[PDB]
Symmetry: C2
Subunit: 128 residues, 2 copies
């Protein structure tokens, strides 16, 4: 039944969870990102970005180059399975993706592409 | 069900693969580690160490303190699911573990604890 997870990125560059498990029952999966901090998007913006483990470094690197006004994401980046907006304190964004995009046998990571954030704001997504 | 994997750690501190999928059909799984490089253990020693993604930091940190002569691993580290010994150029070691030690929705990482290597020699393992 459970095909969504609520995730928080705070003023300390921490996710409240570093592991998400997608039930193979789920045709679609929803990530509800919120920012419970006080700092604005230009200081402590967070996004939720999902890719293969192998692709994460390249997504982080090319996102950095794209800058704040592009949510630190390379536009139309085919390595990105799912992304939210970059959000600041008190904001929220959701993303729904087809679980068909998660291939059995792949390793997945989620991360924030705000420059410097992905060192601490990284987690692993798996299927149960 | 292939219930083993051949893994190489080389002189450029690369795994030949950064992703292992263990077939849920496997009661046991075997890692065959080789060092195809020419650098000896004291400069380019590799081990294969498997833990949860959560435990990897602690295992790597506690491993430093043990030094070369204890394979840069905390003795009897309950967080280590599987380990090989530390090997140098043209050496081999194998480890067999029970797949019951893995859980279907949990994230596992394999890494080398030779200080500095785990930045470049970190891979992801999941139960498929
Ligand atoms: Cu962030
Ligand atoms: Cu090594």
């Amino acid at each position: 039944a459970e095909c969504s997870v609520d995730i928080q990125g705070n003023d300390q560059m921490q996710w409240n969870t570093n592991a998400i498990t997608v039930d193979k029952s789920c045709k679609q999966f929803t990530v509800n990102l919120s920012h419970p901090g006080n700092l604005p998007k230009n200081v402590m913006g967070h996004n939720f970005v999902l890719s293969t483990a192998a692709d994460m470094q390249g997504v982080v690197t090319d996102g950095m180059a794209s800058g704040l006004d592009k949510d630190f994401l390379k536009p139309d980046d085919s390595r990105v399975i799912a992304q939210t907006k970059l959000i600041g304190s008190g904001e929220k964004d959701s993303v729904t993706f087809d679980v068909s995009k998660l291939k059995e046998g792949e390793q997945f990571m989620f991360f924030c592409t705000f420059p410097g954030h992905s060192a601490l704001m990284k987690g692993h997504l798996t299927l149960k």
